[PDB]
Amino acid sequence: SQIRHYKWEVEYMFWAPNCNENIVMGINGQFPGPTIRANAGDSVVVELTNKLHTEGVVIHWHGILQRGTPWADGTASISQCAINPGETFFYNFTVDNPGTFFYHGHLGMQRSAGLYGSLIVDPPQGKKEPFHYDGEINLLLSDWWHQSIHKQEVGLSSKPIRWIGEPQTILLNGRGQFDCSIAAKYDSNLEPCKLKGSESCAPYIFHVSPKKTYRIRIASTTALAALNFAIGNHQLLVVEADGNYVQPFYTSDIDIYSGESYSVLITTDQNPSENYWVSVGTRARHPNTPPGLTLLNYLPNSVSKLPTSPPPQTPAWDDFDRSKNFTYRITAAMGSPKPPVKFNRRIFLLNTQNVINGYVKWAINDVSLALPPTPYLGAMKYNLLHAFDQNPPPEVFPEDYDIDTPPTNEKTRIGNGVYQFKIGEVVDVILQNANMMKENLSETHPWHLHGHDFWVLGYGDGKFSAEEESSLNLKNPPLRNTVVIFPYGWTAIRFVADNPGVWAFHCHIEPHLHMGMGVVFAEGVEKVGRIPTKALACGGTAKSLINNPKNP
Amino acid sequence: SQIRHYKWEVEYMFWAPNCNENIVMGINGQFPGPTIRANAGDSVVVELTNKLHTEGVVIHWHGILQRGTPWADGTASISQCAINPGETFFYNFTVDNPGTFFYHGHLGMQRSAGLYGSLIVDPPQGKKEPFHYDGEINLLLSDWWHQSIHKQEVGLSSKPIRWIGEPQTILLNGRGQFDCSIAAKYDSNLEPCKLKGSESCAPYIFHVSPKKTYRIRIASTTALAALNFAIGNHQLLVVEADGNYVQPFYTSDIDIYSGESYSVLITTDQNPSENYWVSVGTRARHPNTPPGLTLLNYLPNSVSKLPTSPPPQTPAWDDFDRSKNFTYRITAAMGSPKPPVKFNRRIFLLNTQNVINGYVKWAINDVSLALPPTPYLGAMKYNLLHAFDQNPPPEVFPEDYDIDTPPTNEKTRIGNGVYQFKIGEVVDVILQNANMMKENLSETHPWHLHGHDFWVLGYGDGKFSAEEESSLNLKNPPLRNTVVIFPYGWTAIRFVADNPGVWAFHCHIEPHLHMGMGVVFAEGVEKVGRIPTKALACGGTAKSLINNPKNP
């Protein structure tokens, strides 16, 4: 047990991720943010000073359960009011279990502006990891556009919508290249980068010694891109996923969607006289972004010594069978917690893309989420019944819905009610994907649950029917916090409503979140303790806690 | 027979083909240029005045045979010295046969700048076409870049080479739209163009009346793209290819490579209350350019009445079996001239991408063409034996060459010798494609012969061998002036060397010709008559012919 204290300021600054200058949101003058590293069971105290000028900020600690501390989850209008310019707020929370986690902006579209970094929790003090490696490498993946976040925000709030488009650069630990390639050698149509190694966009090189084994920790905070990770001539052994251990298996490359984290081990077996390419390319959408590239540099080979091969070609973006083939393998490591065999609640959530009042919105069982100005945790503790809609949101959709047709948008509305759970319910969620407004298009959506991990019971094609029950894996299902629904399919997850608080469950692609694609879960709120005053200080909660009468 | 006289001035001007201003090369203030139309048997006289400030100009008339007028072909350094600023040149030639032709700049990269237009030839007066139609719709296809042609020229001549990239826009009759789509209603990701229809980039709408039949004449002067043409809900019957009638067949779309012209017939037999999409999309290279679109407007429907369907989705760019399936189906119309059955000369031309002295160049049996300052025709007529290389260029490549693997570049040279034929020779040219510099890459190349039409005897995969001799079509082969080689395959054509003059045979993709991909054929020059002085007044021809002694 130890307290790790971080003194942090967030400020916009000029920076050039791909050697083209723009503004980035840096923490203590650096981009990406600093790494937090602690051992399981420690308490992390972060005092954040907001040094932005007109904007409020919040930081969300992705994958941390916020057990006892629902108020530090870092979701504006759900766990807290956002931190005002010039104010300091303390995020104090216990890191319970080891893993590869990260943190990112959770207000507006501030994470796409660069607010994110690594949070790595080692085993309890004195304990060892269940596997052996001699070194580790940390990789955080993100994506980068050249337009302003605030021009992109106004574009997605406009009628007609101005879609943000495919990213200009895929960043690997904050660096990437635009309009040139470090692997130009293999193709005369590519431009060589004129980089010395010193630049803001020069690639983070992976230095390794031959005949050793390493843990490569990989996390994604992309706003949109689903990426594919591969190392030339090196097979990967998947050992951890979303802070939990999986039954190990070998693969030549992994798919990683936004909100996921993996640990993969590699052994430097291959010929020690050469360097090998690390390639991270786009999958799941039709690519119009070059691959993020770097070198697995076998010491003492010169880093200017190119590999003999081109980078590994990324698998075809639309080979979803290949995607499923990897996704469906992941199973819990033996010794993990097995699900409750019987559920107490099952909810069906239909994911549609709609047009509400001329605005292209995303909707879950026809409600497109719009968050209130009063934080739900505050509202529910103080029992302010006028702060949001108290009607229960829709828990099932019409079984006569044709998931292969565009929506009609007849009854689609905007709303902000909450699904409430009784503290201890075993909840089941089947996420159903469908056709979007464009004929014959259904996309992949990564869904992430705050303040909990869930067991991934299964995935299927088409519409979920009750007869699907015997395929659900109750024996070995992995424990995760992020999961994908594939085109035209469903996914079924199970968790226990055991953590007092108001938690978000939303699609982790930042534009879809900005357009309403998420729901809010709240359970055991009468068990929440005292919330920090700064978290209560706005909306309905400020109005009703500030004693300010009249005549007095 | 009439004499059709044109009086034209070539000059640059600001123009916005896609509503983005740039400079374009216009004729008499027009972009594209004026249509020439004549009847077979007429003489065309074009007096062209050069009003570019510093640059020479020539205009090549694609598909006209220049029988008796070889000096009028418009190929700088082959038929003539270019026309200097402020000078006027007379191109006087006959049109022998009916067909869809066009004209384009043939000095440096002037045609990519906009120097092109149509040249159509009707049947002899009194005679009629073998097929009936009520209307005619004419369409010239090109592609457009937003970068300067003089920066593209320099970039292609630099070490490292700077590839011109995929075009920004496809131009249908000089017009196209960039960064928005006139079909944006079917996909919220697309930006709607705001166009009242009066703009320079506003679509050229095809107006048709119901229950009528129309001949749609389509020609391509693209610098780089291979395009696929389709109209929503309508069948296309192919009746003419390169000024020659083909045996008719119905197809749902046609593929068209740079240098080809087709005439298709359609019938307006569909639901008369709606309009339909015309889509010209990129194939044979990974697309990065949006499709060219316009409407088949069934009168009296308002042209702003959009179609119920989206535009026909383009065939997958790399399905070369679908491409070959269209291409192989083309045969001469019943009654056409059949080939001489025995040949007198057979030449094998291997097509490779090479690196000669740091520069990426294209080579034909390892000679990358560099054209001399003396025009070959004048040079050969006056027997100027030092103006270019008198050593006969290779008519065969080595049988130990592996076309599946990159060149070694060991012997690759730049050259300018000429292949010579005796007037009356039947020549067969076997075009062999091979792997490029990148591993596992071979592209399509359209090849075009000047001053002759040829029979396309056949195509095949891999390297041509004596086993393939029996597959050559000698019954029904089509007469064309442009033919394609597919990835790693061969194409065999046969023609008779019966036209006195010096003729270019080259790939019609403008960068490839700029990089050396062409050969020069000469036949019967002893029988060429008087060459206009402007065509002789440069290089070694002006040297020998201008009598300016010294001491005399």
Ligand SMILES: *[C@@H]1O[C@H](CO)[C@@H](O)[C@H](O)[C@H]1NC(C)=O
């Ligand atoms: C957070 O921890 C710091 C350091 O122990 C303490 O000063 C601060 O008051 C704590 N705030 C809350 C809300 O726990």
Ligand SMILES: *[C@@H]1O[C@H](CO)[C@@H](O)[C@H](O)[C@H]1NC(C)=O
């Ligand atoms: C071309 O035609 C014009 C007009 O008839 C004539 O004056 C000129 O001399 C001709 N030149 C040649 C080379 O035929």
Ligand SMILES: [Cu+2]
């Ligand atoms: Cu989270």
Ligand SMILES: [Cu+2]
């Ligand atoms: Cu997250």
Ligand SMILES: [Cu+2]
């Ligand atoms: Cu989503």
Ligand SMILES: [Cu+2]
């Ligand atoms: Cu979230």
Ligand SMILES: [Cu+2]
């Ligand atoms: Cu041509």
Ligand SMILES: [Cu+2]
């Ligand atoms: Cu030509």
Ligand SMILES: [Cu+2]
């Ligand atoms: Cu593509």
Ligand SMILES: [Cu+2]
């Ligand atoms: Cu070519």
Ligand SMILES: [Cu+2]
């Ligand atoms: Cu030519």
Ligand SMILES: [O-]
């Ligand atoms: O989370």
Ligand SMILES: [O-]
């Ligand atoms: O020609």
